[PDB]
């Protein structure tokens, strides 16, 4: 049957990914949280 999660590269870079997170202030807060935790991938 059809599942949740049908992947798409452009959509994945467009809702997450660096320039979308830097474009709002709460998004910049997720990148600051992820830096401060020391995550290997920020997005």
Partner RNA sequence: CUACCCUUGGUCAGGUUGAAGUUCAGGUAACACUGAAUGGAGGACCGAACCGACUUACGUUGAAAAGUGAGCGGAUGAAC
Partner RNA sequence: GUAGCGAAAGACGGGUGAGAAUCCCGUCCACCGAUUGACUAAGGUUUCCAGAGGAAGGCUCGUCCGCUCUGGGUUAGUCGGGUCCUAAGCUGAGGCCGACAGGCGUAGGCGAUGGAUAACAGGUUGAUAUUCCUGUACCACCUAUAAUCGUUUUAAUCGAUGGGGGGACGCAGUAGGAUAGGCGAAGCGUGCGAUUGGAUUGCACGUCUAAGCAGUAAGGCUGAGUAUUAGGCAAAUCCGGUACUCGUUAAGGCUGAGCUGUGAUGGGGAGAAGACAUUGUGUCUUCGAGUCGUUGAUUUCACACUGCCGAGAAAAGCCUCUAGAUAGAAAAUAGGUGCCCGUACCGCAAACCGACACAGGUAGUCAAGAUGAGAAUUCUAAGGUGAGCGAGCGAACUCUCGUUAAGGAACUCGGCAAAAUGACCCCGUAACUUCGGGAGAAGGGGUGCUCUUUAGGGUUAACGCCCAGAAGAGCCGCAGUGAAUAGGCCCAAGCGACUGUUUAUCAAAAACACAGGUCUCUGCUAAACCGUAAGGUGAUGUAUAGGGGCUGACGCCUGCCCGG
- For RNA, the closer of residues 25 and 37 by Cβ is 25
CA dist list (Å): 34 to 4, 15, 18, 19, 38: 26, 17, 12, 15, 6
Q: How many CB atoms lie within 10 A of CB 25?
A: 7
Binding site for RNA (CB under 7 A): 1-10, 25
Choose between 10 and 38: whose C-beta lies nearer to RNA.
10
Instruction: Provide the 8-state DSSP code for 38.
Output: T
Report the residue number, 4 or 40, with the smaller CB distance to RNA: 4
Nearest distance from residue 23's CB to RNA, in Å? Answer: 8
């Amino acid at each position: 049957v059809k599942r949740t999660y049908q992947p798409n590269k452009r959509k994945h870079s467009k809702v997450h990914g660096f320039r979308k997170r830097m474009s709002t202030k709460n998004g910049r807060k997720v990148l600051a949280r992820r830096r401060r935790k020391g995550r290997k991938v920020l997005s």
